[PDB]
Design a protein around this ligand. Structure first.
Ligand SMILES: [Zn+2]
Ligand SMILES: [Zn+2]
Ligand SMILES: [Zn+2]
Ligand SMILES: [Zn+2]
Lengths: 86, 121, 86, 121, 86, 121, 86, 121
């Protein structure tokens, strides 16, 4: 779909769609497209663990699109950064 | 690139199989996996690699050691993504190091460690 | 992607890609495309429970693409029907 | 549809919230969900339905009652898919029945049961 | 992508993306997904010729996404119907 | 469903080849196309159909008679979409009518006409 | 879709699907995905003009997917390189 | 970037508008395009660039100077792709050079030529 410049441009639902697009490319024959989408995810979330949120989720939360969104939301808030679009 | 059959015994691994993929020669080919590939023909190592990872995704004891997103990758023959701290440039997924299709000489290592291995480190 | 008219046309890896396409549409604003892919899934798998395999997985198996493929593979084999492409 | 404010208190639910969505008037709006939507403005009922399902995906005790694929649907405001045996034609997901934004007059029913409710049954 | 309910929900650019999605499905192995997207196109445009705008463009305009948009825009205006989003 | 080779001469067609696809028995197999398929083996008619349309997309004299979107369809082995007035329900693309792989007995017709043909109309 | 590492892995029909995927991204908000697909197109075709075949077609051929495939097929044959999968 | 109103008259162009985008200061803003954007408000230059290219795709005499794939790009506000010989690394599409919304101080240049302009060349 369309890649927005920041987290504030994505509603939670829209961010979930980006995650599902990443999941689709994750099972593609190559990582050509996947890797670009992962760079975009790392860039906009600004979370220090980057892709780990996806491939190495914490045991303290669900290994799911909802869990990823929740962890991201909690971290950005704990660090005074703009959250998802309302 | 050259065909051949997979041979080897491998080794038993715990519930943290790839915890040492970034040290020494990394993790070995699990014995259970070796049993599934032993004596099979492969047109190329890349072919062995895809088959290897698909087998991993089917082994309950190993799959549970990976997240849903990494299991999906292995299911299609692709190596799981490593933690961010273990990548090296565009190399972001576990790699197979040769010490052929001899599983007893093949190991799983992170990109960063793999580079160091070939540099004497 | 391309929709084959039989389970025997799909390798296990290819079927997972279809499941992932289904998941992507599952989070789309409407179910227009999703519903066509589900009808296709129901038609080729031929399992009496149809979409339940995706939305209502049994507790005896993993709620995941690998689990869905596994259950289909076993049920088809148990019923003497052709399996995934080797 | 005309805008309005959601009202109502709802009812407490167990770990089988929708088990009776295919009977009588269906399942009531959970009190916990009602609390999150109470006094909120919505441009239309459809906008209410989306927010409704969104809140469900956020409620730990409710989301755990749904599969991963169905939780993803609710997260984007779509009603979860019902079991195959409860669908009716192209209607394959739970529906909201009015007994416009009064959460105490709204219940969750399967499409099959919903049609019977309106056919006098 | 996301299928909006009416023409007024689509900016011209967004409508072009829907056309390119139709083009992609047009070359897919089957018409399963294509046909649903075509029904949506017919429904929202409300043009009497429906799919002909796509598969049988008038000689008076370009056989392209831009041409389709232009013809649609001219017809909806000539009939006092809401146009694309500004 | 049953294999076989394509045979036949076909007929020369003008720059409006499918103008009569909705009348009588529709349009014939163009002679130029017949020359490209003659004596070829096909596992099934469906296979012949895909090959047929791909050949059409490669013939400059015929392709120019179709829009860009219809040429793209033919390039992948799918029949072009008919005008809206010629469809019949879910049948929205030209169909091949048999009067086997005998191109001299095969014709191109719209869905609406095809139905009528088989009903004596 | 799946990106093959050689022209010989693609049938003409499959290559057109890739061109159509390229066109879809061509109208996406950013060029993130488009650019990866173009690099791939350049790599497998091996034509010295690379992307020009798509964005700067010669007047001696049709500006279309069929034209792009035709020019590639002729150039590869003329240079004794393997062609599309039969 | 700060908002503003586009100004300027631009210059008349022929059927080879960008032929000299890779030389000197590049191609000027067409007068016809300037007329469509004059006195309009834009939240940022990027917003100006998108509207700019959008107007180009709508100008018959200019759009005909671009391929189908490049016209599609401009229609969504993206700059057209330059010829392979004029790119520079990941910069593969025409760029706008300032000599902020003064269309008479804005020109279209290839990335290769643009880099030289700023390197004092
Ligand atoms: Zn090594
Ligand atoms: Zn009701
Ligand atoms: Zn017939
Ligand atoms: Zn500059």
């Amino acid at each position: 779909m369309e890649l927005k410049n920041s987290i504030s441009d994505y509603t939670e639902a829209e961010f979930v769609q980006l995650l599902k697009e990443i999941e689709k490319e994750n099972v593609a024959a190559t990582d050509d497209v996947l890797d670009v989408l992962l760079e975009h995810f790392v860039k906009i979330t600004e979370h220090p663990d980057g892709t780990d949120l996806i491939y190495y989720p914490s045991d303290n939360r669900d290994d799911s699109p909802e869990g990823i969104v929740k962890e991201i939301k909690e971290w950005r808030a704990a660090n005074g950064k703009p959250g998802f679009k309302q | 690139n050259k065909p051949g059959k997979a041979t080897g015994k491998g080794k038993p691994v715990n519930n943290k199989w790839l915890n040492n993929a970034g040290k020494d020669l990394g993790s070995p080919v699990p014995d259970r996996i070796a049993n599934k590939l032993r004596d099979k023909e492969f047109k190329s190592f890349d072919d062995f690699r895809k088959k290897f990872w698909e087998e991993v995704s089917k082994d309950p004891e190993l799959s549970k050691q990976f997240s849903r997103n990494n299991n999906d990758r292995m299911k299609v023959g692709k190596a799981p993504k490593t933690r961010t701290q273990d990548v090296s440039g565009k190399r972001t997924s576990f790699e197979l190091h040769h010490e052929v299709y001899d599983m007893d000489a093949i190991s799983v290592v992170t990109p960063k460690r793999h580079i160091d291995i070939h540099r004497g480190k």
